[PDB]
């Protein structure tokens, strides 16, 4: 019932071609493409009214080309991809001017397609995930238990960290770093580290039947990307770290 | 066409006011407010013309000269920490020109600060430990051996908020967070 964008994350080698797909809400005639860089607002790229591309004043260069052949599904193609094309490509759809009762005239956005252009894919790495058990001093000082999760050595910054308690996702008592740390700030295209906390009541942590899991959803290479290194291909994968509750 | 302060802090558990300036607004243009959460796309909140608007998400106060407006979030929680975009668009077109917006940070007031630095052992390892600086008041600033920035969590069912920072190295926590001023009343077990 929303706008879908695929792939969520895309790793591209400099000079290769990329395609970003948008599935707008059915019956919406307007389709929009936006480019969004770090710490900046979405910048207009192109506009479609059904199949006609009426406005393309925002397209950065000749390498940028968009299609919506049947007035529905749209594709944004970026040829001979450059490092400056690395951004979040947003897609939006709305349903014309004053079409229908209570029409708010709002833009419905997808979750975006983050593109990261790299010179060499040999630098792509999945994270290593570790869970650090609540301190015994914390439990006796506050009657609270903080679980710490560490996602390390991942490149690029294509991660989703989430906490799972007994197979169900938890959001309460959770804080993940809004941005990751460079493990080597004196190095370019250095690997990242990300931390998160899950704070529960000490009674909940002291139950040994309670299962805790830190999940890190990583986005790396696709099937089409060639891999000739002696290490496992850094594909889009989930890396987890689990822990049972500890009584005392 | 709209101007907003790039970043702003607000009190947690209170209604948050977000200002916007649109001096050259026309009669046909509406004022729209969008919200963008991290790793998400912008999402519509509210819109108005001249009249004050109220929905389950927020309130929108437009001045009578229509040169400025205010987005009012009824009760600011840690989940309201996002970028808020105030945009103006002509009634007939659909295209939206986004400005830089406002980075809103919902900050709680720690009633009972209990600053402490704890050591946490790895679930599956030896010589693997992190330091946890936690329960320090919102006025404490943590300076970056790896040190993460300040993080606010909300134990919603317990009406409790806490601040924390994580430090690790491959070292002893006692000297981990010493570069920025950590309360002198910090528990070091
Ligand atoms: Cl993906
Ligand atoms: Cl689980
Ligand atoms: Cl929850
Ligand atoms: Cl999942
Ligand atoms: Na949020
Ligand atoms: Na925290």
Numbering used by the authors:
A (entry chain B): 2 to 249
B (entry chain A): 3 to 146, 152 to 177, 181 to 199
Article excerpt on this structure:
The human CD1 family of antigen-presenting molecules (CD1a, CD1b, CD1c, and CD1d) is structurally related to MHC class I (MHC-I) molecules with the key exception that CD1 proteins bind lipidic antigens. The CD1b cleft is much larger than the corresponding clefts of other CD1 proteins. The unusually spacious cleft allows CD1b to capture either two small lipids or particularly large lipid antigens. Recently cloned TCRs, termed PG10 and PG90, mediate autoreactivity to target cells that express CD1b, and the response was augmented by adding micromolar quantities of PG.
The affinity of the PG90 TCR and the PG10 TCR toward CD1b-endo expressed in HEK 293S cells is 99.4 and 48.1 μM, respectively. However, the placement of the PG head group was markedly altered upon PG90 TCR docking, where the PG head group is shifted by 6.0 Å and locked between the CDR3 loops. The movement of the PG head group lifts the phospholipid slightly out of the antigen-binding cleft, resulting in a displacement of the sn2 fatty acid by about 2.0 Å compared with the CD1b-PG binary crystal structure. These conformational changes are also accompanied by movement in the PG90 TCR itself, whereby the CDR3β loop was repositioned by about 7.0 Å to make favorable contacts with the PG head group. Accordingly, the antigen-binding pocket of the PG90 TCR is not preformed but is molded upon CD1b-phospholipid engagement.
